[PDB]
From Swiss-Prot:
It is linked to Parkinson disease 18: An autosomal dominant, late-onset form of Parkinson disease. Parkinson disease is a complex neurodegenerative disorder characterized by bradykinesia, resting tremor, muscular rigidity and postural instability, as well as by a clinically significant response to treatment with levodopa. The pathology involves the loss of dopaminergic neurons in the substantia nigra and the presence of Lewy bodies (intraneuronal accumulations of aggregated proteins), in surviving neurons in various areas of the brain. One of its GO terms (cellular component) is nucleus. Keywords: Acetylation, Cytoplasm, Disease variant, Host-virus interaction, Initiation factor, Methylation, Neurodegeneration, Nucleus, Parkinson disease, Parkinsonism, Phosphoprotein, Protein biosynthesis, RNA-binding, Translation regulation, Translational shunt. This is Eukaryotic translation initiation factor 4 gamma 1. Residues 208-323 are annotated as: EIF4A-binding. It comes from Homo sapiens. Belongs to the eukaryotic initiation factor 4G family. The chain holds residues 1233 to 1565 of 1599 of the full protein. Residues 9-131 form the MI domain.
Length: 323
């Protein structure tokens, strides 16, 4: 039938488009080609094919495919609904593939995660929709877990947990009736998933740094936004230390410290870390930070070195911290 060939032809073109994209990596060309299909109600096929063809290709291919879908979504060519339709077609068969493809869930997470980027789908909505096919499987956790893993890798479990929480997400929503959340979370190692001016502070400092604000801009902001008591508080010290050190994390594998960032912020930190007491309080904060990053190998020491080198934390504070 016409409709039959239509689906055939579309898959054919999705293949051509997808193949060229993975080969040349020209995002803009791929996006336009999809647009030229002018078949919004059949893009589930494109999605399905993209997933199928890259599932066992490579991590990089899955990444590129995920990014393209996010782009298509963002450009308004691929509807959320069509995206889900295409995925469901494969998520439905996931459990079965697990037999021959052990890390299938991981591969799926690698394909979906890019969708969480700005302009994409909100975590709460994504997690809730994406898991319907797994409502039957009773395997919702298998996927979300791999997704949370990827996110952690790129931003830290702490921030991930906050994202999860802000979405009002609950494991109850994804676990079999009666399963002990406390246990599951403890066993799968996701305890991290479990306004106050002090918390607002963290959010604002984070934003300031995220937007590449100069030290003066931050100095001014603090002066313009906190009271005298707040300005000399340990709370500011801890929040500042945390935001600054966080902004210096390079999320590669393994994680590293961008000493150039620290050097650039040294003066900002010295200003508030004006005594041994405050320096110590800052070290505690940094420590708790690294802890949330799951004590990666000797990353703390890397911060210590840079901090000592930049004259941000002096010897005595280090001595005292040792206790």
């Amino acid at each position: 039938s016409k409709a039959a060939l239509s689906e055939e032809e579309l898959e054919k073109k999705s293949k051509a488009i997808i193949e060229e994209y993975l080969h040349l990596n020209d995002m803009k060309e791929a996006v336009q080609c999809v647009q030229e299909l002018a078949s919004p109600s059949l893009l589930f096929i494109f999605v399905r094919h993209g997933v199928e063809s890259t599932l066992e290709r490579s991590a990089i291919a899955r990444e590129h495919m995920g990014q393209l879908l996010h782009q298509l979504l963002c450009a308004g060519h691929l509807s959320t609904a069509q995206y889900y339709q295409g995925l469901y077609e494969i998520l439905e068969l996931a459990e079965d593939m697990e037999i021959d493809i052990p890390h299938v869930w991981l591969y799926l997470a690698e394909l979906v995660t890019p969708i969480l980027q700005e302009g994409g789908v909100p975590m709460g909505e994504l997690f809730r929709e994406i898991t319907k096919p797994l409502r039957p499987l009773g395997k919702a956790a298998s996927l979300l877990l791999e997704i949370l893993g990827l996110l952690c890798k790129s931003m830290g479990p702490k921030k991930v947990g906050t994202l999860w929480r802000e979405a009002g997400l609950s494991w109850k929503e994804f676990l079999p009736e009666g399963q002990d959340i406390g246990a599951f979370v403890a066993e799968q190692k996701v305890e991290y998933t479990l306004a106050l001016p002090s918390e607002e502070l963290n959010r604002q400092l984070e934003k300031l740094l995220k937007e590449g604000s100069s030290n003066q801009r931050v100095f001014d902001w603090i002066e313009a936004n906190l009271s005298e008591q707040q300005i000399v508080s340990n709370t500011l010290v801890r929040a500042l230390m945390t935001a600054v050190c966080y902004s210096a994390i390079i999320f590669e594998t393994p994680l590293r410290v961008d000493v150039a960032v620290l050097k650039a912020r040294a003066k900002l930190l010295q200003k508030y870390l004006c005594d041994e007491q405050k320096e110590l309080q800052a070290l505690y904060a940094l420590q708790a930070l690294v802890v949330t990053l799951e004590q990666p190998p000797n990353l703390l020491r890397m911060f210590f070195d840079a901090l000592y080198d930049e004259d941000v934390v002096k010897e005595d504070a280090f001595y005292s911290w040792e206790s």
